[PDB]
Design a protein around this ligand. Sequence first.
Ligand SMILES: OC[C@@H]1O[C@H](O)[C@H](O)[C@H](O)[C@@H]1O[C@@H]1O[C@H](CO)[C@@H](O[C@@H]2O[C@H](CO)[C@@H](O)[C@H](O)[C@H]2O)[C@H](O)[C@H]1O
Ligand SMILES: OC[C@H]1O[C@@H](O[C@H]2[C@H](O)[C@@H](O)[C@H](O[C@H]3[C@H](O)[C@@H](O)[C@@H](O)O[C@@H]3CO)O[C@@H]2CO)[C@H](O)[C@@H](O)[C@@H]1O
Ligand code: CL
Ligand code: CL
Ligand code: CL
Ligand code: NA
Ligand code: NA
Lengths: 417, 417
Amino acid sequence: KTLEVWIMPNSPQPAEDFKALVAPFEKAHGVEVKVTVLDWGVAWTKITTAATSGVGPDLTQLGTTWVGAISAMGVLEPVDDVLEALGGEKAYLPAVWRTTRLEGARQATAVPWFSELRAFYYRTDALKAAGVNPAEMFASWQGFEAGLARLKASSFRDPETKAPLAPLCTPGKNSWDVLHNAAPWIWGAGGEIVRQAGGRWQSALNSPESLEGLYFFLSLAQKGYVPAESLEKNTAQIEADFQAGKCAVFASGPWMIQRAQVPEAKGGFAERTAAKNLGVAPYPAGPKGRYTFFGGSNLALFNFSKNKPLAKELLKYLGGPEAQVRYAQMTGMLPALRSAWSDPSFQQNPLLRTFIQAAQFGRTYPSLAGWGGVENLAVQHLGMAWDLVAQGRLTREALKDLMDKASAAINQALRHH
Amino acid sequence: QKTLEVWIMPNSPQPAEDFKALVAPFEKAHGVEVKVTVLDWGVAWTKITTAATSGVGPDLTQLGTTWVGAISAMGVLEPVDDVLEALGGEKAYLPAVWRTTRLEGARQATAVPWFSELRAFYYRTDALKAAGVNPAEMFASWQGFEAGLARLKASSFRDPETKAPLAPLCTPGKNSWDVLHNAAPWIWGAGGEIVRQAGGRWQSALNSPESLEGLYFFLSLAQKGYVPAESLEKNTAQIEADFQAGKCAVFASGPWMIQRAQVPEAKGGFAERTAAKNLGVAPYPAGPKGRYTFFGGSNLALFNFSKNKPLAKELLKYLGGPEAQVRYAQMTGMLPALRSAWSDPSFQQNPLLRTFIQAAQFGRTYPSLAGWGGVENLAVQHLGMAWDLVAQGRLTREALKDLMDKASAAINQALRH
Ligand SMILES: OC[C@@H]1O[C@H](O)[C@H](O)[C@H](O)[C@@H]1O[C@@H]1O[C@H](CO)[C@@H](O[C@@H]2O[C@H](CO)[C@@H](O)[C@H](O)[C@H]2O)[C@H](O)[C@H]1O
Ligand SMILES: OC[C@H]1O[C@@H](O[C@H]2[C@H](O)[C@@H](O)[C@H](O[C@H]3[C@H](O)[C@@H](O)[C@@H](O)O[C@@H]3CO)O[C@@H]2CO)[C@H](O)[C@@H](O)[C@@H]1O
Ligand SMILES: [Cl-]
Ligand SMILES: [Cl-]
Ligand SMILES: [Cl-]
Ligand code: NA
Ligand code: NA
């Protein structure tokens, strides 16, 4: 008797780590859990195709921002019973509890698996040589720009590369992170990705404060703090650039702390200079508030599964205290189950404590039926904003026109695919 | 106790597991554990160059054929003339494959051929039949190719699973090395080239009249609405996933997709999908100056800082030899690099693969130059910006020329470095 699970690359050896996580469940129940790893860039295509075709795994990993969109298609088995078995609404942060369902829905369609939120990694060696105080650089937008300017002027060279470091690396194309990396600047300026306007969600990417935030962020590339090359790269490539010692600063989740402690052979970067000179700081406060992206992933059961009782036992296992701590140790993500955040393993990790204590500023998108389509279009149009910088064509007016077109396309996507 | 570390790219549906099965017989004969690390193609250049500059990495790495010169020129690869001699020397290989064993003009081979691949068009047999397109006409010539795309665009055919129309052609517009490899046959078919020898040096020819004429024809297919806007922000993996999901009638790929079509989703294929039961292959059409396709593959290279060179060379002889050659080509859907391994029935009896074997007559490679990794990164970056001109409605002959002038200045720095 057999289960199929789809996962995304959450750990350095994703399939191997997942098989080690579930080995105790397989021995307790005498069942094989098969796992298939889907890269984040293809995960939306494969999960939507399973949903429309009626053919797929028993369980899939679902990014928190996609839970509503797949739930709206009527293909997910309700999992209120599993959530109750794990201690109900009180066993979770309210933010995590909202990701268990499409907004407004009666029944939970996803079990919280892990949480993640964004902050700035920085080269402790690079900022000290530039004379940049991290606490000041990451406190405000003025501090953040002032720090990048000192990093740009610095004569510091990576000991291994013997070359200067880009002050800031950020992916300009492909990745969902093109949206998640823009969102804190939009939010900090008092903007948002979407707003409710008389019963209906619509794009707010072209609101005055959304344009102010987005323009500040884009203007960092325009000022030469982000290298032109970075504007054509995706998250994986920017990550690799940081590990290789080529960027002083970059935004990521808590998984990089875990990657920093594991050799290249096992998918980490423990051998690199960047791993030995690693700091973390939260997103700076904008003029209207202080925000970072908060998300993570849940687990969802397809209602066409031929193994629903067994699949629910797997959900209860993976969502429960033991598996929560073990998978968070293997991945460097945060447990989704509130109680596991206290575990000593997490408490005593200095860089991880910075992530945990930055949760205070965590914000996520509303859980809407349109949302996978919104992320695809957002990533495409923000990709074109980064192009305006690459081309030396970034003005207030060209960004406004571009986000008007993004907003028209997003409004379509909130209505239908 | 004896250990080897090997870096590979994702050549097969379950890359690490397939490689471990490939090397099991070697591990049992020699009492050695081979550890494999899988590097996505998008980060492979950064990781391999960082291993080269730092002097820390694996014993063996997979190297794309087009990178063998570039890593060799960094002084970091072990000569492997002894291994190539043991596998039968120059006569055991196609001349095009033998040129990928070394930096142009080098006395010593620095890589062992592992597998070969070349590009052709997959097409939906059902979509072309419904549109009234004769594949022999569509894939004969540039005019026939555009005429076929026009019928596909007009067709009222809908995918049985998606219930939606198919884009006539999908092609990746960003990130992937394939952005270059996909443009090369149009450049070559117009009588252009990526580089040329002038003043006793290699330089960009991407801004020659014929190179611009082939690139312009290619980009004009998106301008004419035969390629969806969405595709122009996607990488290879996402375009492949779109084809498997039933969203594209035509796309350019290698022979590995034949293998993926025969394996369920759970094992990394698409056997469940309509496209898998409606799969045709046709060669690149002849351009005005003749018929060309991209011919590449991957070789295996030994870092000259390896602590295990005798044992690593025994693994190279194994992986390069007749048994392992057929086995890995069966598991990946590539072609063996060793000419003699082409006789196996897995290749000779495969009717879609016959189309690739026949396309090898028109196969063309890039010169094995110092600096080629830089050329590909810069080509992909600038060709990414050419696809952006289409997305922005700014594609003109003079805008393409100005952009390829910028590409050519950047490329010439990389070839001189
Ligand atoms: O994401 C990997 C892709 O997924 C498919 O299902 C297959 O696994 C396949 O490997 C595919 O990626 C493309 O694979 C080809 C062949 O390995 C790559 O082509 C090589 O590119 C190198 C770098 O430019 C060249 O040196 C070499 O000659 C080519 O064979 C291509 O880059 C992948 O995107
Ligand atoms: O928007 C979809 C989904 O995104 C989730 O974040 C993902 C990012 O999309 C992804 O790019 C990032 O990828 C890294 C991976 O987890 C690590 O193993 C790393 O080493 O490799 C990848 C980068 O190359 O992961 C995050 C976290 O899973 C959001 O969490 C989610 O809310 C949202 O729905
Ligand atoms: Cl929002
Ligand atoms: Cl694997
Ligand atoms: Cl060429
Ligand atoms: Na693995
Ligand atoms: Na699919």
